[PDB]
Design a protein around this ligand. Structure first.
Ligand code: HIS
Ligand code: HIS
Ligand code: HIS
Ligand code: HIS
Ligand code: HIS
Ligand code: HIS
Lengths: 307, 335, 338, 342, 315, 335
């Protein structure tokens, strides 16, 4: 049996279920199954509960923000980040001040819910005491900020600004695994492998469009010659070119050719312009679930961390 | 109005089904949105403001917005026919309704089946006018000053607008009709010529913003083409079929004999190989065509008649083709 | 009277959301004009109008003729239809709403060494005085099941609150309830018995025979409905997989793909040329292949595709896969014959 | 039957959902009979102020079913529900027939306009040539039982019934039915849909009622005494609901002079007369009974007028406060219950 | 034939208003909760309409009575002589509309650069009343145009202040006005519609008596004593045990050695709620026990000048 | 650092609503600004809403001065800390008991007391008695006192009561109120299995009451208001009209009756009514307190002695001679 922890509430939870639904890995009850991965069982927990059960051995995998992983995991050696950047849950844990200064003789208050990571940053380049408090309004009320910043709007609303070097950590959602489970529970390691591969291929896919265009041409080679002259019509390896038939004088002839290329989403609009310039029409654009390519070093780095 | 601002602002409905359908349209365009102000990353430097629809029209006129998506009813009532508002796309194919006049089927309106015979009723004079309950304070007076009805007072009715004729608050109603079931439940009928306006959700733009603010026209162009290609796609199916044949050309002749297997320009035909007696040969060919969704079932039958099997059907985000006159007409309105 | 085809759908419950999700996955989205109102449209099918009802009301209205089609669990069809021959199951297994209506008895006590329905019947505790008490919501199917299996002294009741708690509270001796995973039964120290299953149930497409033979348009939209649901189930199902591969000709690449066990596709790989510029000349150095891959096979197929030099492997889902018609249509027409 | 089950508790069924539920819980709170909802998800709570009294929250239809089977002993339910689901069973005894909430009438409504414009009477509706065995009068209603009974009684033969989809009142406008049989309270739903009531169209007048099972009352230990207490408490609560206690300071020489003053006033009579007591205050360091306080019950509808009268005779500092119960002589209801029991 | 009184539909004003009527034993008979008309049956022909406060002012300007914030009355009422506030202080919804600035050493509005160009930008919801304060206070350089408290960070403010904590999260003379909930009536009904004047009279009397009561406690104590006058002297020796006019003193009997005698006396006084606790201490000091404390719906006393002031406004 | 008294109250659950209902009925109304609050009825008193566990902890840390919490939370999380003093141990809501439940079937059939669970031998150092519980601290302390050491405790996932049926645990340690959960899950209490009796309680910190000026007197005020209200909740005031010749005759009648005793005896005053144009005190009104549980029987008794028009009404407070809860608190404080 293989157990994977997922966030139970917050946007991290809805974004995680949205991620799984986009991978075609769909999951009142709190325990579910992902049937497309053999013997994989999902447990919905708060992220701190994912870290706690991963350390104890009740879970084998988890998806958690890097902030929760580093504070509640404490840099414990048992935890290994398999994928460090699932590209959601973007934030940074940092300190905010109003818009070395010697006023402290042990007799500087920072309000934070991160009871642990504040103290650690004081050994690196730091007289600091921590509290727990509307957290964002704490400097104005006199409680004491060290908090998560994403868009930074909360900082501007409370007349608070950010410092150079004030970012203690950059955080995304991450796929993490238990070391005791990967070495000791047979069957876990291969599904963490499959999970990493699927997440990489989905992230690449997310990503691209497949673009298919009708083009008038005499040969497949002339048409490909036209597509490859265009800078952003390169595709992964080049246009797939196939014949397109239509009835002329009661007889059929391949007057058109259909090309298919991958196009990055950010490049789509200008690509369309380019395709119109070389005579393409009826341009079908569609999304992808996965794009599998050559494996990234992430698997080998995981094995290097394991031995 | 005149504010140094790097970003193009697009107003979207904040509450109602227009909000949910608008966010649904953007998600179907793969235009994911990032409080009350968000960003659309895919369109360069495009920033979305969620507002009440009247506030979208008001802020477009005041200059706080550059584009908006709003129903044509909200646009015509609150814009009041101002020439600065240009509909860029007049038919986003959701929010369909019509603002019209409904009158009772009973009482004195039994044989009042046209707006004209509603007019010539000696019941209403300067003292006791024709009471019409509506939330459309501007458009009612306009519709009947355009059609010559002398003595009409308009009111906003307490609670259930449709029940006002039954309660005695008003003699008729001026309201939005979609399926018409609300009218039928209260013994109300429309009339010939009673339709004040036909409405859909529309992409609207400010003339002053497009002319004066850098980048507005290009992102309006991108949004219009994206909306047109997405509507075209929603639209069609991609249909891919395996067919046994000796050559690609024979297979193509077979699919083209069929009326609704034409596709956009014709079938794409490619070889399909399989192992026979340890040797492979292109015993099959796979064809690809676009099929309109309303033709899908019939197309499947036709594909079976010519030997097709394993017919894959899948949807499209966009279909980009030749640009519609909507762009050229917008530039015509701008000079 | 009327010229629209009416399709009944469950209004509340998990059956309702799963049904609307099935229709959206078919690109048959429902045009909820009023979300307070109970009637919507499916524009992709001509004159097809959806009515949101309680499932019992779907069966009642199919029998009365106010609906023509319905999607309902087989348990509800059996309990509220009572085997009326006018209700015909068109598609018997839409693969959601899986459960079984069965008998559960305590694990402990009097029922320790009772594990068959016959051994439940044999117990002597049950006479006209003091019968076997069964708590159930299935007012019709319980008595029929128990009169058919020779269990002679049984009284049935509806229970307050948690049906599964009725035997512990003393309200009842056994229950007749729906079992899916069976965890509710385990949580309440209950067990099924051999022969205790009254019926196996899924969501199903049902039609009125009077509507199909007598009302214009019903039989063809039932045909399209059956064909679309079957094709969608097949699609759910597969992935289309497209890979770039280096090769000199289409035949060499095809032989490489077919040498691999699970890269067979439905009929074999489609192989087309992929052109790329080398030294200012364009040439088909690569070829793109497309195959269907079953989803449970996806990962291994990827490995197989990498072994033969594949790259840039696009994976995407399908709304439909239409193939040869299943006998379900011919079976329907035979049921209509007379 | 649940008439044989051994249980120490006396069981009172209360409506689980609806306006009847909240109004019933309001009635209990106004009687200081607060229900200790042990679990809100659970359906059973306790009323600790009455010995061995346990409340079950049920559908009203389930309250009637359970009273007939003997699984409940008392219930509070509208008389419409009692007539529909009890069907006039002789075992159901109405102990209190008018709890003065849930007021409505089940009646027949037909369109104001159409063929029914001159139809104001019920047998005007009967002497109508439109309905035969071929095409009957369609009536939408949720009352599967009471409709047939009412119209077999009033000389109308050719009638069909439907449990209409959704908005019952909109059934005649949609063409689902030609009339409706429904509950009317203020009648605004009838006016909103251009429908009207009829002479003789009223099927029954209904309020919330305290009902009991006769087999339970005679056979189950403790039931009769707690229905006695409930009826008494309810009667008193209604009387209190009702009155104000009014207390006034008055300048006077003796209690009898003050009493003479209050009793000259028409609405200062009280239940039996003003209670009069001395009110002392320090003048120049000595206390003396310069004032007197009077206590009277005043009906709420008289309060304002009573105040004016109390000022005319020199009253001030008029304290007005409400009452939980007013117990007086028993009404005939209890004896009537015993006559129905034998 | 009908007298109509408007009440707020949503907000704390709504729950506080229905709580006010609920405390007055004028229960509101909401026959349809979805509908907007209810009745007060204890006052003959008194009908309640639930709507937003601007709508209440709108209909009083077009209703016979309304209960609305003084802010809504002054902004939407236009200072019209037809709207007469009969009771100006129902003691709920209390607040002040005032100006807050981030602007450090500026503490008076006069110190509040601002010209034709760059006119003092205040984001504010007071479409009518905003102009009034500065058109009257001599800053001619002001323009008016969400999540208001962050407006100084986002790009001074004129808003409602109650406890002021919302202001603290983000001046002298900045107060535009002080507001409470008020019972207002239209002159058109009072001079012209029969029965409006009389039910406004009853409403004003009930509201004044309830406000007095809200207010006090009735306190009843057992005290051992020989005579009523002795016990009364003991109660009156204590400063805040005076009551309205003095303690009501009555005999309390108990069985001693098989014979009954008035060994105790019960006193009744009104005690203000704010004074209750020390009143209990004082009552214990003079030998009281079993002190029953209970609330009041109304305390009617002599009419306030408000009715005669209203009639002076009516002539 | 801070200057005004802080009172912790439960934030969520029925404990929260029942607590706010009690305080509002005690005239300690909480003025919630928006979701920290204030109680203005006690001069200068400030409320903090927290999770029950947090209140105890914050009392221990110094951040709180008072709290209202169930005694189970107090004993489980306070760990018997001497800084926490219960001021009122029984606010008469949140009633429950923390106790041990075991199955009725199987091994445990003929086991109906704690000592018989002890003299059961299924449990060894290797395979101990598995008890599912949320009380990480309290449970072990209870069983070393009169049970075995062959006990392991666990936190059950999900439904604690279903843990013995699922095989997770052999017994549970849980809160019992009405006992329906245990009966629904075929579980049973044992004699001597009760670990603790719990109600909601008013708790205070010793450091705050002795050391922070103003804390002790506002706990005095809230303790007296809470005790007073509880006493009143409690009683009825009952007032009856009685025909009689003298007040003493009427008093003798009420006192001849067992349960009409009142607190000290009936108050008796004259009731006047018009006879022949003359007024005379033909009646007398008596006032007594009646415990609510006795009300109905007292009514019968009042009728037996000729009473009529019996007014019954409730009380907010009943203050008497000072309760020993204050004197005992001061004894625990060293005055
Ligand atoms: N041959 C095209 C499309 C494709 C990608 N993968 C398979 N086909 C490209 O390389 O971009
Ligand atoms: N060649 C097919 C499919 C296609 C459209 N666009 C690109 N390919 C058609 O013309 O319909
Ligand atoms: N011929 C490929 C792809 C395909 C399916 N259908 C049409 N083409 C296969 O059989 O998998
Ligand atoms: N004696 C007063 C007050 C009272 C009624 N009952 C007891 N006391 C009256 O008859 O109104
Ligand atoms: N006599 C007491 C109580 C009271 C007021 N009104 C009537 N009684 C007082 O003057 O305060
Ligand atoms: N004297 C009555 C009522 C009372 C109590 N306290 C004051 N009065 C009694 O002792 O019960």
């Amino acid at each position: 049996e293989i157990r994977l922890g997922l966030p139970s509430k917050g946007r991290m939870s809805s974004d995680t279920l949205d991620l799984l639904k986009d991978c075609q890995l769909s999951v009142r009850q709190y325990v579910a199954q992902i049937p497309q991965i053999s013997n994989l069982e999902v447990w919905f927990q708060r992220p701190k509960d994912i870290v706690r059960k991963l350390l104890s051995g009740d879970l084998d995998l988890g998806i958690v923000g890097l902030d929760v992983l580093t504070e509640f995991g404490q840099g414990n050696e048992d935890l290994i980040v398999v994928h460090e950047a699932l590209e959601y849950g973007d934030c940074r844990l940092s300190i905010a001040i109003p818009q070395k200064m010697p006023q402290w003789t042990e007799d500087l208050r920072v309000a934070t819910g991160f009871t642990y990571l504040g103290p650690k940053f004081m050994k690196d380049n730091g007289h600091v005491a921590f509290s727990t408090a509307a957290l964002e309004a704490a400097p104005a009320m006199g409680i004491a900020i060290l908090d998560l910043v994403s868009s930074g709007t909360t900082l501007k609303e409370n007349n608070l600004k950010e410092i150079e070097g004030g970012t203690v950590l950059e955080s995304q959602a991450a796929l993490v695994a238990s070391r005791r489970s990967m070495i000791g529970r047979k069957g876990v390691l291969e599904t963490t492998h499959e999970m990493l591969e699927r997440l990489e291929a989905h992230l690449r896919a997310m990503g691209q469009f497949t673009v298919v265009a009708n083009m008038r041409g005499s040969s497949a080679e002339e048409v490909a010659e036209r597509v490859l002259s265009q800078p952003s019509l390169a595709g992964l390896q080049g246009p797939t070119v196939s014949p397109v038939f239509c009835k002329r004088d009661g007889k059929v002839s391949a007057d058109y050719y259909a090309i298919v290329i991958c196009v990055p989403k950010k490049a789509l609009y200008k690509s369309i312009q380019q395709l119109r310039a070389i005579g393409g029409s009826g341009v079908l654009v569609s999304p992808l679930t996965y794009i599998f390519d050559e494996e990234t070093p992430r698997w080998r780095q995981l094995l290097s961390k394991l031995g």
